[PDB]
Amino acid sequence: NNYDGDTVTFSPTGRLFQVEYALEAIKQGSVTVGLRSNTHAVLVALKRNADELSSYQKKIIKCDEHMGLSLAGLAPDARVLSNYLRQQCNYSSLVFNRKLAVERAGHLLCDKAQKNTQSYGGRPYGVGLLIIGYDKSGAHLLEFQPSGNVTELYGTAIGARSQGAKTYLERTLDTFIKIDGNPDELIKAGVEAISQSLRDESLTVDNLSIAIVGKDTPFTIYDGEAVAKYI
Amino acid sequence: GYDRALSIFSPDGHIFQVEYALEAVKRGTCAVGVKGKNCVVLGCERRSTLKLQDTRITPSKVSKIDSHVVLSFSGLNADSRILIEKARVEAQSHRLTLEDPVTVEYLTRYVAGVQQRYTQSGGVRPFGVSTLIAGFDPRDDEPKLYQTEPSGIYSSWSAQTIGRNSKTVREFLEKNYDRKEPPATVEECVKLTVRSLLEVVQTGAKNIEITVVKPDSDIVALSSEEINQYVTQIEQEKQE
Amino acid sequence: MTDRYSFSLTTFSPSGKLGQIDYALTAVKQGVTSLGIKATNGVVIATEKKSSSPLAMSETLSKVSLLTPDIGAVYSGMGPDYRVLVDKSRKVAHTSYKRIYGEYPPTKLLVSEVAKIMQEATQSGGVRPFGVSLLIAGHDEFNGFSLYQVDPSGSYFPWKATAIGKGSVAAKTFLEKRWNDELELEDAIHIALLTLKESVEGEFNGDTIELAIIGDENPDLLGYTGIPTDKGPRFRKLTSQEINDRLEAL
Amino acid sequence: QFNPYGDNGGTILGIAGEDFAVLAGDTRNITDYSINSRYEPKVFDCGDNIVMSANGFAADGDALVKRFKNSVKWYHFDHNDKKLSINSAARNIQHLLYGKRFFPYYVHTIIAGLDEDGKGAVYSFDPVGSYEREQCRAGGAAASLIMPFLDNQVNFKNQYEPGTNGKVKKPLKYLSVEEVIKLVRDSFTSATERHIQVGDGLEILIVTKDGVRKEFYELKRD
Amino acid sequence: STTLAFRFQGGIIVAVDSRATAGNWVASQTVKKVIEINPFLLGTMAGGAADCQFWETWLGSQCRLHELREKERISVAAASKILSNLVYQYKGAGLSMGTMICGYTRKEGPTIYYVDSDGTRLKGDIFCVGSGQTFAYGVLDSNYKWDLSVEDALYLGKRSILAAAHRDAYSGGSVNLYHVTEDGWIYHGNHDVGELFWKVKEEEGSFNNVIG
Amino acid sequence: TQQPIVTGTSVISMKYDNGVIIAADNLGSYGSLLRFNGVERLIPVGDNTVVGISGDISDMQHIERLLKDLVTENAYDNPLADAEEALEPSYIFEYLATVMYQRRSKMNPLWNAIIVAGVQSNGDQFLRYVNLLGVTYSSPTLATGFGAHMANPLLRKVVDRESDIPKTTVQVAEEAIVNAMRVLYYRDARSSRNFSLAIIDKNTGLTFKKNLQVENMKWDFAKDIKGYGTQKI
Amino acid sequence: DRGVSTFSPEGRLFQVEYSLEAIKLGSTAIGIATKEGVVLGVEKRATSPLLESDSIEKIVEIDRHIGCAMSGLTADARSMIEHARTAAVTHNLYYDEDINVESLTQSVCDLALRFGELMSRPFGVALLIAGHDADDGYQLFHAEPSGTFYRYNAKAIGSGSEGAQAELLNEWHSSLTLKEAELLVLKILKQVMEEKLDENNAQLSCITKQDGFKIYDNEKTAELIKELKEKEAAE
Amino acid sequence: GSRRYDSRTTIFSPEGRLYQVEYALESISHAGTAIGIMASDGIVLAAERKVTSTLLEQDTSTEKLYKLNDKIAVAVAGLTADAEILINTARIHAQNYLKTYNEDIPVEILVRRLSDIKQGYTQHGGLRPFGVSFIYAGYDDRYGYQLYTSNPSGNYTGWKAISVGANTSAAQTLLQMDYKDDMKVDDAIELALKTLSKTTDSSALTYDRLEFATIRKGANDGEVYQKIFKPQEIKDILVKTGIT
Ligand SMILES: [Mg+2]
């Protein structure tokens, strides 16, 4: 109200409204789902078009051979944060001959987002990210909020109507975590999860975006006729 | 440093600081540019609210940027000096590196670029100045006349006016300037320029300045008497 | 962090007033009365040592300060602002003059430097004006004795005699009646003590009054002998006893 | 005084075929009269069907290869996983090298692969980034021993057709990958005999449309 | 190394040898010593190979930006000066460059500028740069006329490089010929010096000192 | 640019069937003065890596602190710091190799030759060299300074190529290392009798041996040697 | 007042949303992508008859294979064009090749959100970036001041955009010829323009693989306008 | 953060005016009147000190008239402290020019420089403008005797006769009425003092309330002399012109 003019101002109840408004941009964004087993991790993203002449905005970005994310909210902010992740993954490989742990990647994203919430002149990031990866401790899924909060999960969803997919994953938890050594079934579970967030529209061939990373699987994004198999 | 964003968008998509800079131009004395077949004439209004002025030393309204290009303006006088200095430096820099003097369009594009820069740089306000830039490209006999404004947009004109009551003199020029047959001589071009200012000026005395620019760096400012002869001949034809 | 106040805090109001300067002058008006009187063979500057508490040792608080061996200063208004201005004035006398010309600055030029510092606090980004008016008395070879007033705006004026602060209006009228161009230093000191008594409520003695003079060279205060051209400082702060002696002849 | 440079010996050889390219190099690493390693790989698969070797001062060599591999990675990120063509890689390496024009990578770089028409390509660089597409290029210690032999046996220089006596040149017939590998092996066998810094092992990377293949051969260890 | 360029009635002839040496060791016989800055401008390579290559393709980028901004072909004067001003900034750092910037525009006609790494920029009709420059100058000076045909001018440039290739130990390999016209340069082939020498010796009757 | 002041001589090492051995004497020389006699030049990092350093001792102590800091830093926000996300020999080496090359590129080198010996997570032997120039290389046997000239020839007689490594036991390897240290003591004027030896084995882990001495020395034959040519008495 | 980088309660940047309003006031620009080339057309909208309309430059070349049309505060586009041209030329210098149309567009869009308290405000201009590369063929992008760019088969920006976009919705199909696209841009420009469309107040351009980017002569466009009039009178 | 307290000194009003410049001009209108009059054989500078005191040391006092170099002087109207900042900068510019070209700075070049400094404070920096209007009286061998004025906007103009400070409307009308082109310095001296005598807000015009200066070629042969009048000399010229 009087305390939402900038990110450097607490409200009387201890809230940061600019951060909450940045969080609101994610809720307006298109739905994207993340889920994993013990061998693979999967991203599923509903891409959004401007109209029938336009392309469908890409949602998934590769960060390294073993890591990448999906976005919901301000796409240019995701580009800034994903670029930063690419650099940090790259720094780890070049300097230490070491693939960047997914948990450490989350810590770095948290700290980068935090600096934009405590200083004058800046603004919070207006995007949520779902980071998947396969490192020395197996498959991982992270949920990034521009408040700085990064959370390791078995499955989740962010964007508009993400609550339907999140409840489904909460029911299916005991099933999809056991889908080991079967990439296609794990993706099916993700495509079924994201279907719980659809209204009026359904998953078409240029609508659906899927990514996967696993034990012997580099982070690869599937678009176009490559996802028709799952429609 | 001072970094405050003074020029910003309003809810209706307007940048008020740029629009208020135009209001400063509206207040400035009227300037007019008319290009003939083999010349360009820059006319300028001098408000007669200031007498006891020393006209030898008082900053003249038309400024040479190089030997072949001139610049006149309407709006804040102090602001115009900064644009004129920058333009003059750039003109010499161009000669030094390209080994050829600036084209009138290039010089216009530069000045317009400076004006634009001041509409989205932090800590600065836009120039309260619109300019008329006239001359001839090196080894070219085609007349050139351009206009710039605070926003940084620029364009070429067969004839144009800026400043106070420029709506009235543009009205005159739009009905009196024929594109198929522009003022064929210096005389005709100067006459049409003086006529256009007489719609707005008041007394045709020391209130009208006229500068004629011809090809090959031939620039001359008309004196009071020379202009006074045009003023005399115009009204004697009008008494009919 | 970083000082993000890079804009002026003093600006022109619609009426043409610089508010912060006017308010600084109001703070000076509330300040304790100080005065200066110029004689033919010296200058005197004086003020009241308004002790904040009787437990406080008011001798440790110097309202009258040596700037150079031949220049002294007194103030009315905010003490802390004065103290830092004295530090800057002392330094600028060296950096912008003595380290260049090998001699101390003339009164008018040191005043000019102090005035410049005060002017800049009136225009520079993220600062308020100094809440003091200074009276600077001094002597130099080519200008003789002089007395200057410096205001928060950075404006300075030379005076024969003047007063600033609390009871300045009454004090200036008192000085107008008494001042002439034939006063000796002792006459000016006498007038200073008379003028200052009017604005002082409580105790009026050498312990509650601070008084200094710019007069003859004091070779006894030089600290060394052997150089004929060096004859000692013209600034001298009067002792508590010296003031009381002249209060009997009052 | 600290000398930031050193000489790790080694000899490399790039030959462009009609639809293939080979980049070979010995596996011996040395300083002065000592052997550091009898097997230290010097020719590297850099992705996008490009092979590279930066011979000379091994620290600068490793740094350059590392930075180029990194450039391939970021080329994919920035340009929608587009394949870096050999000509584009070559121009990119010029800028990497010239970037240190006043403190050069003390190496002679050679890259090999296929051009955008599928034909064999070899590019050769000097330490500060001047480069050219070449058919045949030896680099390093025994380059002066190998190049004249290649001029004679690959380009048939000074060879004329018997009976014509200098009037008709020996025609420049295309060599197979098996033929090139024979000349590479004989080049390195001969270089090993007469150059003290050449020996131990020979590693050859062969580039075709099918990808990158490796071959290793023993060289004399004295 | 031997590079030359000369102005004539039909435009400009640019001729260069092909040899690169490191001491006595002949590093290459197939070096491209003409840099195709763009379809209308040519530069020659002498001194530092990298310095010439790098900064003259950089020059091509500046020329392209100029014509995008100004909607007009850059003059040879302006193009050469961009390069000379650049290398002058680096003066003292150790750049090694001796080049002819060659072009043919409407306003200038055929124009050649000699540009140097110590900042020299000279307009001229005939320039010759490299270890074998003196030999090529001899043939050029004694046979040059403004009214040479394109055919004879091309041969003169070829013959002058051959003269240098023969005598100068650090010149040879092959001769590259270019003819610069107002509508752009035209490449006139690579000519092996070995084969060219015997051909010229027989047809011309020159080099009687050499047994063939 | 500097010059080394207090220096450590050879570091020697080799691979064997189940791991690596590394050794270095305990001397810190000051030119020809054998100044410091209790200098540890093998520095263990965790339980899987030993970094052996020769050259400038002040730079060695700096590197030692970098490695100590590396262990602290790795443990930060790392629940698997003592398991899957522990420091590998390859991580430690690549970090040092980066630092060495960066420092030489600023013309301010760490005046050292370094051998990182260890065993990787998968049981693979790690043995790689890096020096003040940032030059790196790997070999079945590695040695710095004098060791390169005298130890390598002896150690290469045990493991001459990659295929000899599985045939070489820890007893044969240690015996070869210990003999090489004796040979270096005979022939290197900047060596000492006292040394340290570290074994990193994929089964038995890190065994660090301090206060070892060169023994079984041959000197008796010196009694018969008289004069420099013609002298009989 | 309030930060330039402030979020609204709806989660939108005020300044970006306001710059979009300025673009709505701009003159109409239309792009149509076909398999034979991409056509770019603009409304010139001269403020007076004394303004020489061929000095109005709202269609611009970025490289031989990339063109660009603008709508809104057109003075803001000049630094965006400069950056685009530099990016195109720089990439050719580094890689000895043409830059991808998408990569060029992405490079331009990276400038967009570099504002705060960098430039003091977002750009008040939208761009239609049209081009060709070997990997993705003929492409048309819409670059906004939000930093977002969408690829389009056809797109209209400016004051007549929603009416024009509805028209483009009906008219575009994947088998359009270059000639059909030219007439289609002219037809829709004529529909949404205040003044009557002719060769002096409207401009056409195209990008083809063979000839690259070309701005059409007024004589060439005048013929296409006459061809348009006759085919509309044909039924 | 800090934005909250920023007055934004360098912005246009909806009418296209610079707030702070306009308000600085309002400030200057309350300053003592300064008058410059240019004659064929010299220039006159006359200025009124603001309501003074009998204890003010006039002979060492300077608030209105300042020397920039041997050829150029200024009359000040506004904040004296602001004026001295600019005056010192102008003095340095004159010397920089003299060092560079080995010739005295032409009057207009100095005036343009100071005016450009004033302009800068109206367009960038976020600082308040200088609340000062100058009258420049100077001589150079190109244009001879010149009068200029500059104000907080950084705009400057040339004049035959001009006033700044208080009652400029009344003063300018009086000057416009009695000024003629063939006028001489002694006539201009009288006009200036008569104009101040009529426009002053004080009861009477006396020597202690005035500062006076002349720039004459009344320096022995082809050279120029500046004369800052002493208190006694101002008293004499007041009697000579018949005002006291
Ligand atoms: Mg040997």
From Swiss-Prot, chain B:
The gene is PRE6. Present with 16800 molecules/cell in log phase SD medium. Disulfide bonds: none annotated. GO terms for cellular component: mitochondrion; nuclear outer membrane-endoplasmic reticulum membrane network; nucleus; proteasome complex; proteasome core complex, alpha-subunit complex; proteasome storage granule. GO terms for biological process: proteasomal ubiquitin-independent protein catabolic process; proteasome-mediated ubiquitin-dependent protein catabolic process. Belongs to the peptidase T1A family. It comes from Saccharomyces cerevisiae (strain ATCC 204508 / S288c). PANTHER family: PROTEASOME SUBUNIT ALPHA/BETA. The 26S proteasome consists of a 20S proteasome core and two 19S regulatory subunits. The 20S proteasome core is composed of 28 subunits that are arranged in four stacked rings, resulting in a barrel-shaped structure. The two end rings are each formed by seven alpha subunits, and the two central rings are each formed by seven beta subunits. The catalytic chamber with the active sites is on the inside of the barrel. Interacts with CIC1. It comes from the Eukaryota. This is Proteasome subunit alpha type-4. SUPFAM superfamilies: N-terminal nucleophile aminohydrolases (Ntn hydrolases). The modification Phosphothreonine is found at T58. Its main location: cytoplasm. InterPro entries: Ntn_hydrolases_N, Proteasome_alpha, Proteasome_alpha-type, Proteasome_asu_N, Proteasome_bsu_CS, Proteasome_sua/b. It is found in: Cytoplasm; Nucleus. Keywords: Cytoplasm, Nucleus, Phosphoprotein, Proteasome.
From Swiss-Prot, chain D:
It comes from the Eukaryota. Gene3D superfamilies: Glutamine Phosphoribosylpyrophosphate, subunit 1, domain 1 (3.60.20.10). GO terms for biological process: proteasomal ubiquitin-independent protein catabolic process; proteasome-mediated ubiquitin-dependent protein catabolic process. InterPro entries: Ntn_hydrolases_N, Proteasome_bsu_CS, Proteasome_sua/b, Proteasome_suB-type. Keywords: Cytoplasm, Nucleus, Proteasome. Pfam families: Proteasome. GO terms for cellular component: cytosol; nucleus; proteasome complex; proteasome core complex, beta-subunit complex. Disulfide bonds: none annotated. SUPFAM superfamilies: N-terminal nucleophile aminohydrolases (Ntn hydrolases) (SSF56235). Non-catalytic component of the proteasome which degrades poly-ubiquitinated proteins in the cytoplasm and in the nucleus. It is essential for the regulated turnover of proteins and for the removal of misfolded proteins. The proteasome is a multicatalytic proteinase complex that is characterized by its ability to cleave peptides with Arg, Phe, Tyr, Leu, and Glu adjacent to the leaving group at neutral or slightly basic pH. It has an ATP-dependent proteolytic activity. Belongs to the peptidase T1B family. This is Proteasome subunit beta type-6. It comes from Saccharomyces cerevisiae (strain ATCC 204508 / S288c) (Baker's yeast). The gene is PRE7.
From Swiss-Prot, chain F:
One of its GO terms (cellular component) is proteasome complex. Its main location: cytoplasm. Disulfide bonds: none annotated. The keyword Ion transport does not apply. It is found in: Cytoplasm; Nucleus. One of its GO terms (biological process) is proteasome assembly. Pfam families: Proteasome. The keyword Chloroplast does not apply. InterPro entries: Ntn_hydrolases_N (IPR029055), Proteasome_beta4 (IPR016295), Proteasome_bsu_CS (IPR016050), Proteasome_sua/b (IPR001353), Proteasome_suB-type (IPR023333). SUPFAM superfamilies: N-terminal nucleophile aminohydrolases (Ntn hydrolases). PROSITE patterns: PROTEASOME_BETA_1, PROTEASOME_BETA_2. Keywords: Cytoplasm, Nucleus, Proteasome. Present with 16900 molecules/cell in log phase SD medium. The 26S proteasome consists of a 20S proteasome core and two 19S regulatory subunits. The 20S proteasome core is composed of 28 subunits that are arranged in four stacked rings, resulting in a barrel-shaped structure. The two end rings are each formed by seven alpha subunits, and the two central rings are each formed by seven beta subunits. The catalytic chamber with the active sites is on the inside of the barrel. Interacts with CIC1. Belongs to the peptidase T1B family. This is Proteasome subunit beta type-7. It comes from Saccharomyces cerevisiae (strain ATCC 204508 / S288c). The gene is PRE4.
Swiss-Prot record, chain H:
It holds the Pfam family Proteasome. The keyword Electron transport does not apply. GO terms for cellular component: cytosol; nucleus; proteasome complex; proteasome core complex, alpha-subunit complex; proteasome storage granule. Transmembrane segments: none annotated. Keywords: Cytoplasm, Isopeptide bond, Nucleus, Proteasome, Ubl conjugation. The proteasome degrades poly-ubiquitinated proteins in the cytoplasm and in the nucleus. It is essential for the regulated turnover of proteins and for the removal of misfolded proteins. The proteasome is a multicatalytic proteinase complex that is characterized by its ability to cleave peptides with Arg, Phe, Tyr, Leu, and Glu adjacent to the leaving group at neutral or slightly basic pH. It has an ATP-dependent proteolytic activity. Present with 17100 molecules/cell in log phase SD medium. Belongs to the peptidase T1A family. Its main location: cytoplasm. This is Proteasome subunit alpha type-3. It comes from the Eukaryota. It comes from Saccharomyces cerevisiae (strain ATCC 204508 / S288c) (Baker's yeast). InterPro entries: Ntn_hydrolases_N, Proteasome_alpha, Proteasome_alpha-type, Proteasome_asu_N, Proteasome_bsu_CS, Proteasome_sua/b.
